[PDB]
Amino acid sequence: DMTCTITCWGIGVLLGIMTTVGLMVVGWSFLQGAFMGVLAWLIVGGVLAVAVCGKDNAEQIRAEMAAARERVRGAT
Amino acid sequence: EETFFGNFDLASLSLWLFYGFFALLIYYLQTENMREGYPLEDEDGNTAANQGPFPLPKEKTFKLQHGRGELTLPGEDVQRRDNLALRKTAHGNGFPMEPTGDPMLDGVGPASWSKRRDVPELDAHGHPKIVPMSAAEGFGVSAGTDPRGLPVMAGDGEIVGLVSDMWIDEAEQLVRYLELELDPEWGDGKRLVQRQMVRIKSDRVKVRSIYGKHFKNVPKTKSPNQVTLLEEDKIMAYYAGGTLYADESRLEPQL
């Protein structure tokens, strides 16, 4: 699952490139649009590598792990 | 501000004082780095006429842990090899030497090992530092691809066996060795590979240094649970020598 993390960082790089070109059509200069593109990359690509890659596969395995964490507490 | 004489002022005095201090510091630094490998010798094992411009340092003592004793340097060379299968290619000094038999089996050239202590390295509690993972309480693969169960491919494209275990350093939490079980066609028993000589992929583990036919002559550990420093040096040097001795085209000029 390091391969899903790298994919998610690349979708962030691609959104950053699109943010630059979009602000330039609306009237901003390159460097102004590229600072905003860098933040789109870092905030969104980071968020997606925690949320999407953290919905790891497990199916009844997920269930039992969670139902057993719910047994650790109760006596903690 | 005034000068003492001519153009000499406080800055000049400071500069010359630093010059003197730096000369003394250079002398100290060069002398401190001569505690191993001296006195110099010629190509026949005799003491050389020239010993250089700096004299040798006085002695220091190190008090070792776990009751291993004391170490005094500079002293005699205790890591010296005894009978090396090498031959001079010239009558004087400055020319290379030729192996007499098999360079990889004789431990010469890039396959040379140093005669270290025949005991394992210990951690803070006095226990062996490198332990197989099947006996290490609480350890698991937390990231990356697990190589256990994958086949191993040699440098010429042959499958020689399977990865059975991993040997880890528990104090520093790092993998040090991979353990390989050989197929009967390529030898018998188990061998070790240092981690810095493998490339772990999704379906295989690649060792480029040596070929398949070289896998039966890898040195073997005495105990299945611990490895001493001497065995470590002989195993690592064996793999390192294959980068030059595996094929005759690796030794000739590449041009």
């Binding site: - | 490998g37 290490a136 990356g144 880890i168 000589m197 493998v198 490339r199």
Partner: protein
């Protein structure tokens, strides 16, 4: 190609290490609680924490946070408590040292009094972090090399902020607290006293800084090339010489005619790094107090170059010819 050892192939995790102890009872002041980061573990260790809390560290943290907030709140109040403008001009604001007319006396709070109160809290913080670095070696029963190396940089810190202003007779000689404003101080200091290139101790400091960076490229690269022989376990190589040390020494011996040992290369590294702030501070302490124009000093001592050609653009071209007309 062969594996290069820049990123770890597979990570393993076990119980967290809490540290070694002896009769000094370091466990009593250590925090409980650790973490693990797999992103960092691709390069180095993955464990985070724990940390030791003594009195020196607590005092240093409290007094350093006070300095930061006096500066930050002064910067915020200079702008009218406007947060968006505070963000817009963050790199340009500063807390300015006092005016030259006040000498070494206490200035008005609007003209350097807050600067002096905040400087006293930063001083206290830095000297406390150094007493912590000395105490921990003493408690760990190790040498005091770290504390000495830290005091080497503290020497230049104190020369810049404390000693030279006192010898010159004005608090106005100190450095402002800002990002750009402090770089303007560097350029103005160089311009005011001739050319700082011609200060010999500045040249020596540059020599040692260049040498320290060349040595980590050489030492880092050399240690990474002998890691297939266990070369990153340096202490055991010192206590029992192996083939990694022999090959590392022979590489440099065959390259440039002399080499070092496993233990002795770290002394070379320690000295080059330490020598940069010492020579720098000696050079700074001599400016204004002894030498007022370093280029005239170089002309006096005969290491200033001379040029034969002329000055001016019309000695080489024409204004119309530079425009294409």
């Amino acid at each position: 190609p062969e594996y290069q050892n820049i990123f770890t192939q597979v990570q393993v995790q076990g119980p967290a290490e809490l540290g070694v102890d002896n009769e000094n009872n370091l466990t009593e002041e250590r925090t409980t609680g650790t973490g693990f980061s797999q992103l960092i573990g691709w390069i180095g260790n993955a464990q985070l924490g724990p940390i030791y809390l003594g009195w020196f560290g607590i005092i240093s943290l409290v007094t350093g946070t006070l300095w930061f907030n006096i500066v930050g709140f002064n910067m915020l109040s200079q702008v009218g408590y406007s947060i968006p403008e505070f963000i817009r001009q963050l790199f340009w604001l500063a807390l300015e040292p006092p005016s030259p007319e006040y000498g070494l006396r206490m200035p008005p709070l609007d003209d350097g009094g807050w600067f002096i109160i905040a400087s006293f809290f930063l001083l206290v913080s830095v000297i406390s972090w150094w007493l912590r670095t000395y105490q921990l070696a003493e408690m760990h029963k190790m040498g005091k090399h770290v504390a000495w190396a830290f005091a080497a940089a503290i020497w230049l810190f104190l020369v810049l902020g404390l000693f030279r202003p006192i010898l010159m007779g004005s608090w106005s000689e100190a450095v402002p607290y800002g990002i750009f404003p402090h770089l303007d101080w560097t350029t103005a200091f160089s311009i005011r006293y001739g050319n700082l290139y011609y200060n010999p101790f500045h040249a020596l400091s540059i020599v040692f800084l260049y040498g320290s960076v060349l040595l980590f490229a050489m030492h880092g690269a050399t240690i990474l090339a002998v890691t297939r022989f266990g070369g990153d376990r340096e202490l055991e190589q010192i206590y029992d010489r192996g083939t990694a040390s022999e090959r590392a020494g022979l590489f440099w011996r065959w390259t440039m005619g002399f080499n070092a040992t496993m233990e002795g290369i770290h002394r070379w590294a320690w000295w080059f790094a330490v020598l940069t702030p010492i020579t720098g501070g000696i050079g700074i302490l001599l400016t204004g107090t002894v030498v007022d124009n370093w280029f005239l000093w170089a002309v006096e001592h005969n290491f200033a170059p001379d040029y034969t050609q002329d000055y001016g653009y019309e000695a080489y071209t024409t204004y119309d010819g530079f425009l294409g007309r």
